[PDB]
Symmetry: D2
């Protein structure tokens, strides 16, 4: 409404249901979130990754097939998405995914984090080239 | 080259590695194929479905998350894809996926089919509305 | 240690990282948890299900391939697992999966639940027959 | 019947619907097969792997969660399975998966292979230790 955020558009997607697990309270071993189109299109999918230790500032596929890559900066809960549409067109988008972490019960430094608010991202073309 | 087929374009995708299984030599219980962008974009994924009995002229998701649906007419090896880009824009596309079936060994009427040639599809906008 | 729970055995598995989403604060649309062997075997996997509305007291596969089924009673956070080992042998197992739900941000009655403690299940043979 | 093969048992599984793709007619980039219990138990799943280049004599998980690993010797179409049941018990099993390869259409040296017969494997305990 009067929120300083655009919540609909052909190049605007909603990010929701952020999850992550920090098995030792530091790095994530599991991270994910839902991505949905806002323009009445069909797109609605999970973007996630797992590893013994997930890295910051590293591209992960959103899934086995996915046309989308993502990267995370855990220090700022910052998400970066990338979509390469053609040889010459790539979109990127960013957001903060606010979340709350609490003890998960599976070890003395095990924490699980979940989103406390949705975020909206805008996809914008990267100049060809850098 | 001199083939009566367009093999590159922003709205042209390559279909390859068609597979299917007909457990009793009639209906499919498993069907799939690979879809790849031709314009240098990243898109490259598997579209598939399984059921005790897959139906002709029925939409199946390409995968759990997928932004794409497909339907198959097994009588003509005809594929139909659909992509709903927005409230008002939907693309559809069609092709024939030539294939060869041979005995699969898992029952006396078990046949497995695999693609013998790639196919190229063109995505075109459905008039709003029918 | 002095806890009234068995945490290791060939037929004892650890349940951890319970998650669930209640989009309208009532039924789950997403539920899952991790299952791990305690006896030094390799088994370690996710059991989950999604639907527009998940049902209580209904078997869901743990995953596409899984040899395990589960059911949930949301009124008591009660889990039931079933493993059919042979024509004549089926194991079942139960537990409570304690969890905490909090607002998820994706709608005014959206809640996300996560496990606050691990649980241990014991697999026991169902008499042949009921 | 009078076949020199055991087709049923608690430790005997049926292997069927072998598939593989050799993009350049040499190494596989995709390999898979179905595994089913013969004793009336529920087990029935796909074991597969993909990579730019799959390696011989290397363990691959059967799937993301799987309790089973496999390895393949492409020179003899030989399959090896491994199941670690406990700290001290591991089963292994072997078979030949007969198959036929034919041109797949997606490049001049692209071949796709599919099983021509089912195979039966027997799981047997590895002595503790080697
Ligand atoms: N006129 C067509 C506008 C809809 C384009 C939306 C593309 C979003 C994307 O996948 O980045
Ligand atoms: N100028 C942008 C043209 C590239 C658009 C390709 C969209 C293909 C699709 O997902 O249907
Ligand atoms: N002596 C063999 C004992 C290990 C059996 C564990 C089986 C657990 C299961 O999948 O239910
Ligand atoms: N008496 C119980 C016998 C059934 C055991 C089958 C175990 C097969 C496996 O997962 O290797
Ligand atoms: N929706 C969802 N949330 C999660 N925490 C996980 N792990 C998962 O796989 N899917
Ligand atoms: N970590 C994680 N979060 C999610 N939301 C999902 N779907 C998933 O599979 N994994
Ligand atoms: N005009 C247009 N641009 C895009 N980036 C996409 N994906 C699309 O479908 N149409
Ligand atoms: N039937 C089928 N075909 C395919 N090409 C793939 N990837 C799949 O998962 N299933
Ligand atoms: N809901 C849910 N929870 C999980 N722990 C996982 N792995 C999953 O895929 N989905
Ligand atoms: N049943 C099946 N066969 C295949 N060739 C493939 N690729 C797949 O994913 N599933
Ligand atoms: N290569 C391959 N073969 C299969 N039989 C299956 N299920 C799969 O996913 N991939
Ligand atoms: N006696 C027995 N041995 C095994 N190896 C397994 N898996 C099982 O369920 N029961």
């Amino acid at each position: 409404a009067s929120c300083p955020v655009t919540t609909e558009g052909d190049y605007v997607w909603k990010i929701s249901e952020f999850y992550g697990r920090k098995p030792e309270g530091t790095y994530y071993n599991s991270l994910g979130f839902n991505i949905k189109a806002t323009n009445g299109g069909t797109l609605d999918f999970t973007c996630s990754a797992q590893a013994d230790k997930l890295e910051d500032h590293k591209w992960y596929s959103c899934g086995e097939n996915s046309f989308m890559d993502f990267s995370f900066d855990s220090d700022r809960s910052g998400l970066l998405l990338k979509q390469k549409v053609s040889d010459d067109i790539t979109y990127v988008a960013t957001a903060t995914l606010p979340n709350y972490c609490r003890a998960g019960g599976n070890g003395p430094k095990d924490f699980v984090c979940q989103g406390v608010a949705d975020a909206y991202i805008t996809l914008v073309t990267l100049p060809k080239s850098s």
